[PDB]
């Protein structure tokens with residue numbers, strides 16, 4: 532039962548600009564098991580475009596995660612989409628121990644693309660039902676040397692499981708991504724030597 536509290540995601544209770552009627556007061560719910568609200572609970576399609584962060588390529592920022600239960604930790608990614616959620620590319624993986632701290636730093640790579648993006652937090656809980664948690668924020672990127680094409684070629688695809696796609700996490704096993712990218716935080720029982728798990732086809 533956690534949600535992204537900074538930068539403010541779509542329909543966030545924490546964002547003063549969201550009209551009372553549009554706030555998702557149950558944002559800590561996991562994504563639907565059948566994939567019917569993947570990605571971003573579908574909010575990228577039906578919410579006004581309004582940036583809640585301005586990110587400069589090469590600079591470091593923090594995001595925050597807030598809630599009432601950490602389900603023993605797990606693994607997260609932070610990702611960017613330049614096509615309003617058709618494709619997500621990973622800029623940081625937190626393998627193990629996520630979210631046992633409520634603040635993570637991350638560097639925006641130099642070769643990101645510029646303009647409107649979605650910034651997505653994904654979380655795979657360690658203990659309990661096999662869920663995916665996902666919130667997306669509208670953000671604007673500046674000062675990158677990439678294009679959406681060069682960025683999409685150079686970075687890993689978002690790890691997607693527990694949304695009815697034949698790929699599942701496994702209770703009691705740390706989620707260690709096959710493709711984590713070069714910006715990795717290790718926590719819980721995961722080390723740089725831990726094998727990738729699960730393996731999806």
Ligand SMILES: *[C@@H]1O[C@H](CO)[C@@H](O)[C@H](O)[C@H]1NC(C)=O
Nearest residue numbers: 536537591592593594595634
């Ligand atoms: C870090 O997060 C806090 C919210 O906890 C926010 O006010 C601040 O602007 C963020 N700073 C950076 C550099 O991202």
